[model samples]
Target chain A: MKDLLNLFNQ
Target chain B: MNEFTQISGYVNAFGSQRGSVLTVKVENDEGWTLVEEDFDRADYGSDPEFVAEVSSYLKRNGGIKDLTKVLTR
Candidate 1:
């Protein structure tokens, strides 16, 4: 889930 | 239990005049095919509502069985 959230930042 | 698969990718912001368009694309294992959606800038990122929408979309479209077919040519 954290990884998925990180996607928005990239 | 069927564990939810982890998808990877990025969100791109396009334009600014009309508050911008945020495009999110998350990929499967192969990273070739992706599940994509677009939202208004205000609804983009970590907003709770936006997150819920994405979660619902993934639960319906991002399953392993679904991706197996969607990622194929």
Candidate 2:
């Protein structure tokens, strides 16, 4: 499974 | 959404708005869009108004903390 970072600030 | 939308992209970003926000703006409720018409709104609305501003946020950690950092720093 690929991890989602929820990287909003990226 | 409600308005169907408009505009173009000279870059990775383009103008966009929440359906509800545009609805309220059209309805002239002075609540949904107007209430958020402060510093934070300016920051967020910039995402809608100008392409460059949104790009800045997406590229940088440029979050809107406050309208004014210092009263008289």
Candidate 3:
């Protein structure tokens, strides 16, 4: 799940 | 899931959406501000506070504005 990044910044 | 978004409604959309139309008149000075002025002010303040809190909690961006200070001329 290394590619699973939450785009909460966006 | 590129779009399965979800969130609870803390306040009604009227709190935000109505301000757009109501503030337009006051913000533009085309009409009186007696009707929704106070409500708009409250909503604006709440929105700013919400933004700040969300930024701090989510480690996101922050907005800066000490007052509503709309202009009409």
Top-lDDT candidate index: 1
- Candidate 2 per-residue C-alpha lDDT over B5-60 given as tens digits, one digit per residue, 9 for 90 to 100: 11121112122333322111111122122211111223444333332333343322
> Which of 2 and 3 is ahead in DockQ?
3
**TM-score of every candidate:** 0.37, 0.22, 0.19
Model 1, span B23-45: residue lDDT tens: 34455455544566654535455
Candidates ranked, most accurate by lDDT first:
1, 2, 3
Better of 2 and 3 by lDDT: 2
Q: Which window of 10 residues has the lowest lDDT sum in candidate 3 chain B?
A: B5-14
Against the true structure, what is model 1's DockQ?
0.12
Query: Where is the poorest 10-residue window by lDDT in model 1 chain B?
Result: B9-18
Clashing pairs in 3: none
- For candidate 3, write residues B1-73 as lDDT tens digits: 1221111121111112232221111111232222222122334344444322332322211122212233212
Give the runs in model 1 whose Cα sits over 4 Å from its true position: A1-10, B1-20, B41-46, B63-73
The CAPRI category of model 3 is incorrect
